[PDB]
Amino acid sequence: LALSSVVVDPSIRHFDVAHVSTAATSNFSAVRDLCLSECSQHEACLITTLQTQPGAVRCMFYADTQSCTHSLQGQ
Amino acid sequence: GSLELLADVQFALGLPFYPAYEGQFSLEEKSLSLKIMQYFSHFIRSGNPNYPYEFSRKVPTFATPWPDFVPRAGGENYKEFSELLPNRQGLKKADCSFWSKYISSLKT
Amino acid sequence: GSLELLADVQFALGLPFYPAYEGQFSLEEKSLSLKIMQYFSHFIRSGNPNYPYEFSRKVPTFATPWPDFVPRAGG
Amino acid sequence: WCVDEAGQELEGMRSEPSKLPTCPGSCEEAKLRVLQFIRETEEIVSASNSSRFPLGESFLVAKGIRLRNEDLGLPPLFPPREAFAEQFLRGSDYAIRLAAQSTLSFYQRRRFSPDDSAGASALLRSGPYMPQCDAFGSWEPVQCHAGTGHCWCVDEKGGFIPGSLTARSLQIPQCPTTCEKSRTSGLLSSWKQARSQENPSPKDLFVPACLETGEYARLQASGAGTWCVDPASGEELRPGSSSSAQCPSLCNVLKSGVLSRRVSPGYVPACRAEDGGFSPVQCDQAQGSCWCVMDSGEEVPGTRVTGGQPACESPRCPLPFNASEVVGGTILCQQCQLLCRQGSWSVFPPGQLPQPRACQRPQLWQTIQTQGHFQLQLPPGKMCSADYADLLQTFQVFILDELTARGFCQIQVKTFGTLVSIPVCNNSSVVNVTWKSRLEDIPVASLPDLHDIERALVGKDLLGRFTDLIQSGSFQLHLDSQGDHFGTSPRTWFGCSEGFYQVLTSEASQDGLGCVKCPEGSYSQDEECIPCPVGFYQEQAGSLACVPCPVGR
Amino acid sequence: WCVDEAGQELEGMRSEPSKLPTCPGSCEEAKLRVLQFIRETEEIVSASNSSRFPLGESFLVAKGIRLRNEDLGLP
Amino acid sequence: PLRPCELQRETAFLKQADYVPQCAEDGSFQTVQCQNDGRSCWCVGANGSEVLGSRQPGRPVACLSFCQLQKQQILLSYLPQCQDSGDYAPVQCDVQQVQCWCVDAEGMEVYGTRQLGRPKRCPRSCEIRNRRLLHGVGDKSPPQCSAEGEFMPVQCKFVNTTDMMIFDLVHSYNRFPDAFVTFSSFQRRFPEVSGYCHCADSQGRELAETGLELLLDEIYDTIFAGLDLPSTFTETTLYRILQRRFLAVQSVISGRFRCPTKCEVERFTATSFGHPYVPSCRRNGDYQAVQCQTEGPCWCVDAQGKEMHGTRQQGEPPSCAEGQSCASERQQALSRLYFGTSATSCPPTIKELFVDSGLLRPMVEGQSQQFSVSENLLKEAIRAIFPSRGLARLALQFTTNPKRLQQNLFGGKFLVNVGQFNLSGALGTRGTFNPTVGSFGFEINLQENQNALKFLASLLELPEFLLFLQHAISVPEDVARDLGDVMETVLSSQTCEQTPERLFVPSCTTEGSYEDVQCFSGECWCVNSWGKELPGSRVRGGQPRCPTDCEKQRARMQSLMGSQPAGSTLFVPACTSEGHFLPVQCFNSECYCVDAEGQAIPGTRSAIGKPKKCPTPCQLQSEQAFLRTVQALLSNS
Ligand SMILES: *[C@@H]1O[C@H](CO)[C@@H](O[C@@H]2O[C@H](CO)[C@@H](O[C@@H]3O[C@H](CO)[C@@H](O)[C@H](O[C@H]4O[C@H](CO)[C@@H](O)[C@H](O)[C@@H]4O)[C@@H]3O)[C@H](O)[C@H]2NC(C)=O)[C@H](O)[C@H]1NC(C)=O
Ligand SMILES: *[C@@H]1O[C@H](CO)[C@@H](O[C@@H]2O[C@H](CO)[C@@H](O[C@@H]3O[C@H](CO)[C@@H](O)[C@H](O)[C@@H]3O)[C@H](O)[C@H]2NC(C)=O)[C@H](O)[C@H]1NC(C)=O
Ligand SMILES: *[C@@H]1O[C@H](CO)[C@@H](O[C@@H]2O[C@H](CO)[C@@H](O)[C@H](O)[C@H]2NC(C)=O)[C@H](O)[C@H]1NC(C)=O
Ligand SMILES: *[C@@H]1O[C@H](CO)[C@@H](O[C@@H]2O[C@H](CO)[C@@H](O)[C@H](O)[C@H]2NC(C)=O)[C@H](O)[C@H]1NC(C)=O
Ligand SMILES: *[C@@H]1O[C@H](CO)[C@@H](O)[C@H](O)[C@H]1NC(C)=O
Ligand SMILES: *[C@@H]1O[C@H](CO)[C@@H](O)[C@H](O)[C@H]1NC(C)=O
Ligand SMILES: *[C@@H]1O[C@H](CO)[C@@H](O)[C@H](O)[C@H]1NC(C)=O
Ligand SMILES: *[C@@H]1O[C@H](CO)[C@@H](O)[C@H](O)[C@H]1NC(C)=O
Ligand SMILES: *[C@@H]1O[C@H](CO)[C@@H](O)[C@H](O)[C@H]1NC(C)=O
Ligand SMILES: *[C@@H]1O[C@H](CO)[C@@H](O)[C@H](O)[C@H]1NC(C)=O
Ligand SMILES: *[C@@H]1O[C@H](CO)[C@@H](O)[C@H](O)[C@H]1NC(C)=O
């Protein structure tokens, strides 16, 4: 997905955190596929978000949470 | 009045968007029925018509918030399915005070 | 409230113009008590608080007319 | 002629029996309404000069009293006061805004520091919000208001996607166009679009596919099959003769829409018969003015002339880099120049390899600068008791410390009762002191207009206190172990941030769009984007420095 | 000098230490008020000739919107 | 443990000299210092024995801080980088960007922070002290620490009479091998250990002779004994038991359900040593808007006590009013006027779900029985008993009966126990005896404190408190940091009944106070000093006469008469049409003739029915001007 389809909501209480520490950084595809395989191993997590920490890579796992705006033009 | 479904179950189940009742319903009725759909869905998903999830607790934006029904005096809040969807406090206070306090004592 | 005469018999007998109750009463009270004096006088002279005589029947001008008390519904 | 949605003929004379009309877009109509408002609030001011109407007339109009020309001993329509009175009666709120803009325009136009004073337009008041359209007439996905500093994001036709509002940010808002919104809607909650709206089947519902720019891709695929779709909005491109393989090019179907009078651009597209792309030189059927376009007829802004066949030849065949297409624009005819899309500015002085990523989208202003002066430029000319200029940075530090001790570097302003602080000092003292205030540090709740920031900064709080402290009395730093002088320009001027580029150097730039982020293959050094040196490589935007690669130098 | 009934000094400069003042009658004061109204409705017309004020200013005054000289870039 | 500033201050105090060093907390000299009423101040360097070299009479306008003093010393290498205010930045770097470290606004370097380049997550004082206690520093009980690296306002050394002698047991070692979660099991494993709690400074220094309380572990019977270990004693529920018991004991003391902030500590220190300037506080625990010195210089400060440099007035009240609140809404409405052709009242999801719903209405107004101070006391109670949303969540998903809630939060129905002065706080430095001064010179009224404590005890048994606290958990975090901020905001939204038009500009004075009449769209109305229109004052035409003292008194007396028994009557003042007092204002049988603004005339008290000859307002003004002139005739020269 793209960052334009995201609403920030810090009140969610159904999420997990996982740091991956690397100073001399590996290929970002490797840690990306590792976190995707980690969510693939489980069944409850449906959304995986990767963010670049200064000393690590933060993988955040969420259940499917959406905010829908319904109107007479477009949902 | 030709229908058998009254206005609350008209709006909650969303009659104005039906293909059968195509042009019979106005536009503001079609928006209000969408808001009442969102209320009933948010209830039967989470348990609170203001929030779609049990854990999100984001501020509602689609309509005005629906207050809880505290049973004592000073509250007893209820939603009104009007165009603006306002909040009120007393529903039939004189009539239910007659039918509960007085006439039950007269019955005994 | 210090008086024992209530407001109707205050205005009808005209307490605000008394020398005893000199400055205790406002000016609009002093005009209203004059109008109520005229009402009670027009009653106890003729029998109708709108007219001072039984035979004049001129349009009242001092205040608004006082309608009769019809006993049925609608009046 | 052109018509409204509800069967109403728009304002404008009917087109000639063989003459193509043009209908404005959704954004363009609203821009015409805003220009109508500006014209009316200018004509009220022009009436106010001529003294043609009494002062109390509008008070009678507001109170509801309307006197006709007969009641005032006048001919029935010799003074057009009826239309002027009706101007204040086409609404309440529109009338109050008309009165406010008229009062402002009259007082400023007749007191813009005139001939009896200096001038220079110190107030420099910005007009109302006029919407910014696309090249064709559709709504731009982000609208920015220069007066306050808001930059919200609109829908397809209306406005204000809720929650998308931002105020005084360095980063441009990233909100999706009409394709990507429906794309994420179809991917997330399966709210797909319909191929044909009359009576669809579940085979007719598709999740749309967008390009990297944002527009619709050419071939949409559903469960039933594939078809060709209009790139602007997602309806069936050729509802009569749709073909999956080798779908028709834009020029041919556009011309078919023009001749059938379903689309009104005002002209007829004369495209190339070879590939179906646009020939460079489409123009009006009445020969008149002619121009040049990029692909899809996007109207190169700098080439429209009344001369026959404006020369817009293809440039020299080698390109500065193997990326062939210049992003957002083209090169028109080093014998040629570079011109790009509407509402975009070339960061480079030619408007010598001309870089592909050479123009971006301009942003709002970000810093406000003012300056003050002293006569300690040279030691023997003032009472510093020295004749040495070898150390002067220590004096700069000492003056800055004395200043920030005496306020003067953290302006305090009320917000609904409670005070807030805004820094205005960083290496100001040079003597010359330069207060440079960052707009992002100032909130939107306090100082809600840029001119309010100018009033609060040049006012009593900072620049009123400074001149009072210097000219009356002295604050003389001892240094035992300053000279007063006029500044010749004691005024605000806006400027971009450290990483960006100030494109229109005239501070009188309307619409407040003078800051452009420094592009991909360049670095910002002296408020100018210099292309990166040969041995180095740059991959950020607004990066301030360029990075070398060891492998493959 | 001259005074109103409710202890208010009337408009007019105080008379000299040995100089007799003159106070207007009941009718003469009302005539002075009418002449004041005529002078104001003449000075509004004289302002309207000189084109010294915008046309929409009185509309803002009627609507309740009051802009001071600071808001219009004025002394 | 006393700093050089504190010892210099106490030595000058014991000599009874003309000068004592003004000494702010964290053992630091104030950058401005004066003699005791000597009226010639000066600005002093870092060690307090210095002088800027030019002492002016009165307070100096401003002067350089320790940052700038050290900087001017080094210029006249390494450059000490400082912020706008007088405090060293938490990252200090060399002038070449090769070495950076952390300081604590006094200069000495934290040992571990020295490294190449810029550091991230600079440790603060609590983490430094808590790590030092694992490196051999004497006290082996770790001080109680917040979520960030900051000391809790209320701390507990928690160990006394270890092996019959009074010192601190090795608590950081003690907690780990023996898992205690239960007080009865704790005394079974470790008897004769009683919790010694107090409250601390900003640096964590224990307050002198105040709050040194001891608590007995015997009384409490434990609830919530089904949870895992929380990895830190500060995260154990026993620490909340001790903190709630300590705060409940200090509720009847000091009039406040908290340890006092920086304002009260500075004010008490200034009052005790007799400093020429004492800060002026208020109920919540912040510096007041106007803070003058003893006679001459009056000025305004922020919430941290730093002087706003451009408001020193020298005798005149500077009047930086927080009630001065027009210009914001004025320029907001003016900006909304000039948009195009397209703080606040209250946060949006609060008024409909809290105030109008009927949740705060029994909380503060249903039993609003002489509780002017008790609303702030209730804010402190909500902030202190529930310090985080998670603990309130746990308390609300365990306690299914509101009757038992006080048994699970406080010390086992401790609250009625501290309602009748039962003893669990023996052997402490506060008390020993019994208008009345507090622990820090607070004005105490014991029956108000006990009545409010019983009211809070009764309120905590209410299920509507449980529902309100569910709703207060459900608020988003951005509106309010903690539950006390939620409680403050829901009090603030009681007067947020404002749905104004977009373009109503509020006209207001040159100094910015609201004009008495506000007009829009052909209507006009009277407002008070706050932005609420007076009910019924809206007029169709324009220019309403705003009500005088008599009309406000008449409305107030009529409204108060509306809730009173039948035969009882009160004094309702009677006014004219314009609003002046009627010349004779009479009561039960005694008619007196008033002069003006409700002030009775002596010598005219008489019975009803006797005709009066009270003077006209001319004779009243004649008396007033006669007294004015004879007083002015008594002029000196
Ligand atoms: C929708 O609802 C369903 C119904 O509840 C739900 O399915 C359940 O999910 C839970 C997830 O915890 C399952 O519980 C697991 O069951 C297995 C059975 O073998 C246990 O072994 C698990 O324990 C271990 O699992 C891993 C094994 O390697 C270990 O890594 C881990 O550490 C555990 O020790 C665990 O208890 C449960 O069996 C299902 N099914 C049912 C019928 O309850 C589903 O997850 C919900 N969500 C979605 C998106 O469908
Ligand atoms: C982590 O490992 C350490 C290893 O030292 C554990 O410490 C040991 O814990 C046991 C159980 O609490 C202690 O036994 C106790 O001994 C006393 C002696 O009088 C006795 O009275 C008790 O009944 C109990 O048996 C043991 O002394 C202690 N060893 C030490 C401190 O060296 C620790 O418990 C482990 N962590 C956890 C959480 O258990
Ligand atoms: C970074 O490292 C990963 C992990 O080795 C590389 O991923 C491999 O890529 C090749 C071809 O791209 C695949 O055939 C392998 O299956 C991938 N996985 C592994 C485990 O080898 C990746 O190519 C590296 N380089 C980058 C991202 O530039
Ligand atoms: C004052 O305190 C003592 C000790 O806390 C109270 O004695 C307890 O009283 C309760 C019932 O009131 C008994 O159930 C306990 O067994 C008592 N002993 C304890 C807790 O050790 C005493 O009642 C209190 N005084 C009052 C309430 O007036
Ligand atoms: C009015 O218009 C004339 C020209 O039409 C211009 O010279 C003048 O400056 C304007 N303003 C005033 C105040 O007369
Ligand atoms: C450069 O672009 C051309 C496209 O015309 C392509 O054929 C060629 O392979 C490209 N060369 C490199 C090195 O990318
Ligand atoms: C700005 O001021 C800082 C603070 O002393 C100084 O270190 C720096 O060299 C100055 N110049 C620039 C360009 O940052
Ligand atoms: C200071 O300002 C004056 C006037 O703006 C200018 O002439 C002078 O060169 C400036 N000094 C420096 C060092 O730039
Ligand atoms: C305005 O005043 C001038 C002289 O002051 C006069 O000649 C003229 O007739 C007046 N009216 C107009 C409409 O100019
Ligand atoms: C302040 O004291 C420190 C050590 O106590 C000393 O190093 C420093 O020189 C002193 N500064 C003075 C006396 O100015
Ligand atoms: C001046 O007169 C006032 C008025 O009684 C008095 O209080 C004061 O003491 C007098 N001062 C002197 C110096 O006489």
Author numbering:
A (entry chain A): 2096 to 2170
B (entry chain A): 2620 to 2727
C (entry chain B): 2620 to 2694
D (entry chain A): 899 to 1231, 1243 to 1260, 1274 to 1352, 1364 to 1414, 1426 to 1497
E (entry chain B): 899 to 973
F (entry chain B): 30 to 105, 115 to 380, 405 to 496, 547 to 749
The authors write:
Here, we present the cryo-electron microscopy structure of native and fully glycosylated hTG from healthy thyroid glands to 3.2 Å resolution. A cryo-EM map at 3.2 Å nominal resolution was reconstructed allowing atomic modeling of the hTG dimer to around 90% completeness (2,483 modeled residues over 2,748 expected residues per chain). Poorly resolved parts of the map, in particular at the N-terminal and other flexible parts, prevented modeling of the full-length protein. This composite map is the result of a globally refined consensus map and two maps locally refined around particularly flexible regions, the “wing” (3.8 Å resolution) and the “foot” (4.1 Å resolution). The hTG dimer is ~250 Å long by 160 Å wide and 110 Å along the C2 symmetry axis. The interface between monomers buries an area of 31,100 Å2 involving all regions except region II. We identified 57 DSBs over the overall hTG structure stabilizing the protein and three types of cysteine-rich internal homology repeats in hTG: type 1, type 2 and type 3. The ChEL domains and repeats 1.6–1.8 form the core of the dimer and lie near the C2 symmetry axis while regions 2 and 3, as well as the remaining type 1 repeats, occupy more peripheral zones. We modeled 2 of the expected 4 hormonogenic sites, namely site B and site D. Acceptor tyrosines of sites A and C are located at the extreme N- and C-termini of the hTG chain and could not be modeled likely due to the inherent flexibility of these regions. Out of those, 14 asparagine residues showed an additional density in the map and N-linked glycan structures were modeled. Our structural characterization also evidences features of hTG that were previously unknown: the environment and possible function of the 4 NHIs present in type 1 repeats; the previously annotated linker region which in fact is a NHI of repeat 1.5; the globular nature of type 3 repeats, which could be annotated differently, and finally the flexible nature of the wing and foot regions.
The thyroglobulin (TG) protein is essential to thyroid hormone synthesis, plays a vital role in the regulation of metabolism, development and growth and serves as intraglandular iodine storage. Thyroglobulin (TG) is a 660 kDa hyperglycosylated protein expressed in thyrocytes and secreted to the follicular lumen where it accumulates. TG is simultaneously a precursor for thyroid hormone (TH) biogenesis, the synthesis of which is itself modulated by thyroid-stimulating hormone (TSH) signaling, and the carrier protein responsible for iodine storage in the follicle colloid. Each chain is formed by regions I, II, and III and a C-terminal ChEL domain.
